[PDB]
């Protein structure tokens, strides 16, 4: 089974200077929370430890981007980090990351706010991203797929129930994943330049995710 109730539980259970330093700081901090969040997802812990690692290494960037995007829907022209510091449009632009920051605001944060995406819908979307069968190295790509399918079956149902008014609400949720994939890649690239130039402190767990497959 794949109950939408326990997915939201996973989301609830994990609720709590220089923009870039704060960003690297908050990303390392949230990586611990992501592990705990992942374990509270149905059928996840019952996957072989090696594939749990592969999925978490494949999706961590998009999973964290989704979280702070939804977290910032009640914020004007800026994002709320997990450390508790706000990063606004000007501060990010003055840091040299205004472009990718703007994409997050328009393609993600604003779109979430304007459809009033709830924590259940956010939860399912992050579960769909976590259960990525395209991930290379999986011992059982078919089973991950089986789990993803059961996530968006439960999500479509919840939508048609909770929002019977909106018949395309289910499709609108899934069609944010392309932008999320796109934004994740660009954010990741920004993260790599930081590490390479190495003038920004990068703590150990974040450092571990940025190193070779």
């Amino acid at each position: 089974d794949m109950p939408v109730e326990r997915i939201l539980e996973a989301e609830l259970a994990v609720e709590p200077n220089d923009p870039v330093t704060n960003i690297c700081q908050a990303a390392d901090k949230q990586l611990f929370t992501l592990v705990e969040w992942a374990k509270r997802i149905p059928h996840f812990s019952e996957l072989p430890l090696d594939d749990q690692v592969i999925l978490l290494r494949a999706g961590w960037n998009e999973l964290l981007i989704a979280s702070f995007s939804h977290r910032s829907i009640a914020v004007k022209d800026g994002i709320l980090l997990a450390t508790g510091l706000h990063v606004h449009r000007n501060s990010a632009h003055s840091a040299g990351v205004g472009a990718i920051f703007d994409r997050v605001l328009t393609e993600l944060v604003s779109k979430m706010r304007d459809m009033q995406m709830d924590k259940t819908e956010l939860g399912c979307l992050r579960a769909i991203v976590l259960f990525n069968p395209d991930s290379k190295g999986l011992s059982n790509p078919a089973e991950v797929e089986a789990l993803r399918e059961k996530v968006y079956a439960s999500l479509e149902a919840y939508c048609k129930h909770k929002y019977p008014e909106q018949p395309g609400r289910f499709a609108k949720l899934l069609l944010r994943l392309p932008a999320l994939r796109s934004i994740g890649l660009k954010c990741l690239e920004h993260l790599f330049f930081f590490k390479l130039i190495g003038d920004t402190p990068i703590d150990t767990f974040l450092m571990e995710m940025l190193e070779a497959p």
């Binding site: 592990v35 374990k39 430890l49 749990q52 690692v53 767990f205 571990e208």
Partner: peptide, 10 residues
């Protein structure tokens, strides 16, 4: 590799 493996083992 290990920080992730540890945390998943609980």
């Amino acid at each position: 590799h290990k920080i992730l493996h540890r945390l998943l083992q609980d």
